[PDB]
Design a protein around this ligand. Structure first.
Ligand code: NAP
Ligand code: 3XX
Length: 321
């Protein structure tokens, strides 16, 4: 990884952009000539290969955290996978040519970058990145970071550990599919239960759920079984706190949290991806892609529309970029 010739890195590129808050179907526009971000000293520039969408992208675009957002206009997209093309003077972990992936924004809700991953090139902090596992495609790798890190962090916050039981509310989405796999294969849960609708129960079982609960037919909180950990990924903490054992832990990623449940917002860290590398290399934890993935870079508006339906199974990914 010698530096790229400087004239080989463009100063403008194609990206999706919005200049005012609103629905993606109204505000999200293709711009054939936006600035490539200049990197800071602790960042790398990446040639984006694939990007995933997350609900935060559209909630952000609606203006839900405008008071702590970065200035408009915005190029959306948190998740990235691609190839390093430039490294800042303080970077030590990556060199030009490294294949990398991560969630760009250390703090999702406070000063996320203006220059997101739905662009041909993007700038990323060294600290949010990890080396792409050789056995994963760029589509697969881009699908992972925000969701798998949120799954991981919520399970750690809930103190999950070997032999304990866990109930996952929303097992079939970007986050939930990882909550199940991590709980079973990384945290050593003795029993993993999870909720989804009728046609998604077999998927939950395939990912490691011992008990798949159809929420459209029955109410988990009325079951006599109670769990050491309940991880709410839907926003049902009122009910979640009824399913936990005394002294157990309930976490949510959708607020507000009814005590004793806690809400948190993930911190994006490349070190989490690195910790999980061996599970990703062995296939014990797999990426989960929605059957409609990938969407071409021309179809980003459609990709958001599908995500906004709340029906995605695993991840919506954009490729080729
Ligand atoms: N606080 C944080 O750090 C953080 C980080 C990431 C995400 N989030 C938030 O967490 C939530 C989940 O994000 P995500 O990326 O996993 O979303 P996602 O992929 O859009 O979730 C879609 C899935 O949700 C399932 N679902 C919807 N309502 C359900 C219910 N009542 N019960 C069980 N399953 C249900 C759907 O399955 P069915 O079709 O079977 O309903 C679908 O498979 C979002 O609100 C997001 O904004 C928070
Ligand atoms: C990615 C971060 C998220 O944080 C909150 C509170 C959401 O709803 C998100 O999607």
């Amino acid at each position: 990884g010698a530096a790229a010739p400087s004239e080989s890195i463009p100063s403008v590129n194609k990206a999706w952009v919005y200049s005012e808050y609103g629905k993606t179907s109204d505000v999200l526009k293709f711009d054939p000539s936006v600035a490539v971000p200049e990197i800071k000293e602790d960042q790398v520039l990446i040639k984006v290969v694939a990007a995933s969408l997350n609900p935060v992208d559209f909630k952000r675009a609606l203006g839900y955290f405008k008071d702590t957002d970065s200035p408009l206009p915005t190029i959306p997209g948190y998740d990235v996978a691609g190839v390093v093309v430039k490294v800042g003077s303080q970077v030590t972990k990556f060199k030009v040519g490294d294949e990398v992936y991560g969630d760009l924004n250390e703090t999702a809700l406070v000063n996320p970058t203006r220059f997101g991953s739905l662009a041909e090139y993007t700038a990323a902090d060294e600290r949010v990145l990890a080396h792409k596992p050789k056995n994963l495609s760029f589509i697969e790798a881009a699908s992972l970071p925000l969701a798998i890190e949120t799954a991981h962090e919520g399970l750690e916050r809930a103190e999950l550990s070997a032999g304990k039981s866990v109930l996952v509310l929303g097992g079939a989405g970007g986050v939930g599919t990882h909550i199940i796999q991590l709980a079973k294969h990384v945290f050593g849960a003795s029993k993993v239960a999870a909720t989804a609708s009728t046609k998604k129960l077999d998927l939950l079982r395939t990912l490691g759920a011992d008990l798949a609960i159809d929420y459209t037919k029955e109410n988990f909180e009325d079951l006599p079984e109670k769990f050491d950990v309940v991880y709410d990924a839907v926003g049902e903490t009122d009910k979640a706190v009824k399913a936990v054992k005394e002294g157990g832990k309930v976490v949510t990623i959708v607020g507000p949290a009814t005590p004793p449940a806690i809400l948190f917002v993930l911190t994006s860290k490349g070190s989490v991806l690195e910790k999980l590398k061996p599970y990703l290399e062995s296939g014990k934890v797999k990426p989960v892609l929605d059957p409609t993935s990938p969407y071409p870079f021309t179809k980003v508006v459609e990709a958001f529309g599908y995500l906004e339906s709340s029906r995605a199974t695993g991840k919506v990914v954009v490729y080729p970029i």
